[PDB]
Amino acid sequence: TSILNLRYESNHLIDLSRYASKINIGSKVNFDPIDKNQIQLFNLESSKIEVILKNAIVYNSMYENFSTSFWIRIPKYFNSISLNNEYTIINCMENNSGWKVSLNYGEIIWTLQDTQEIKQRVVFKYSQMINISDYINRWIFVTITNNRLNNSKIYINGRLIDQKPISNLGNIHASNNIMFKLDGCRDTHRYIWIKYFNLFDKELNEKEIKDLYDNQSNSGILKDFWGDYLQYDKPYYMLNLYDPNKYVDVNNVGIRGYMYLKGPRGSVMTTNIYLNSSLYRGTKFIIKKYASGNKDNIVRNNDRVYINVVVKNKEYRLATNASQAGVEKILSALEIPDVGNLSQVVVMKSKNITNKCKMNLQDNNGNDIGFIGFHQFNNIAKLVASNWYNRQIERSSLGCSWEFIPVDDGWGERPL
After folding, report:
1. In DSSP terms, which residues pair with 261 in a beta bridge?
2. What domains can be seen in the chain, in order of their start residue?
3. Strand, coil or helix: what is 213?
4. Closest by Cα among 220, 257, 162 to 348
5. CA distance 108 to 88
6. Do 372 and 344 form a contact (C-beta atoms < 8 A)?
7. 242 belongs to an annotated ligand binding site
8. Could you give the CA distance from residue 244 to residue 235 in angstroms, rounded to a whole number?
9. Which of 101, 100, 108 is nearest to 136 (CA)?
């Protein structure tokens, strides 16, 4: 229903809409090999994508409503040179009329301007002085709607963020093309990841925006902390949403030892720019395939897997003896050769509807032992598998919600 539906098809970035508007790709544009719909634009003249709109959809009106949506992953701002430096990323301004998307330290901006030098801006602001952010360097769904009779609105992940009146604006005559390119950015190392760009010839309503968000989420695939597809054979630092201030560690290797959540997570910072919780802490987890019939390494919603834990640059197996006394089965890191008949098969979950990563442990008969979470024993938060979690969800809907964090250049932290 969109008038512009930019998607990487066969082996080309094209417009799937009935208009099939022309796309020109610069020589320095990078496409994520795992999913070429994810596009990286650098702060280079050559890193750009230009869309030549069909004449029928070029915006030139005082009354027609329109909306745009796309996902974006913005690297954390590292230098003061980024303070007070708004730079355009998506431009559809002809002379001095039209619309554009721009960024600045801690914000995403939408700007509209008519042919009479009258303009309005709607802004989404996010902090870099926060323990754990839902926005910094993570895939965010942006939706901007425009009703010529009243206001322009910006939504983030389906929720209304800001709205401003635009009824005072007259005729808006946008450009014949849309330029995706970093313009006016003084940070030479700056870049952005963007995907699923769409243009709509109407003001989308809350329901439509919500459905759009859910559909483009690819809910059948698990995602890492940054929002990318969760993968097999990839080391990840663990984060438990119930207590974000702790990280995973191992008391000792073996069935007589155990995995647990440990103390203060570090802190990372750059004076007056950012102050966040350290994300590269604790023993890393590596997800291993249970069945090898599927060649790709993407972890999907009901995949059975094994969880390997890295301790002193050596891999061990997450497992437990379900024969233990109580409901809460304390988890241990086992020598892979000696796992024996211990319960170790994990069913990954990304939705039941969507939810953060969940791991449901099962015994070798395929019977549920419980979602992996943690429980306090002698003042220590030990990792456990517990059917209590499953039951609690079985009745309405946590200590069993996890985030898998891989090292990413958009975060900047130095591991080890």
Report:
1. 248, 381
2. 1-224 (2.60.120.200), 225-416 (2.80.10.50)
3. helix
4. 220
5. 10
6. no
7. yes
8. 19
9. 108
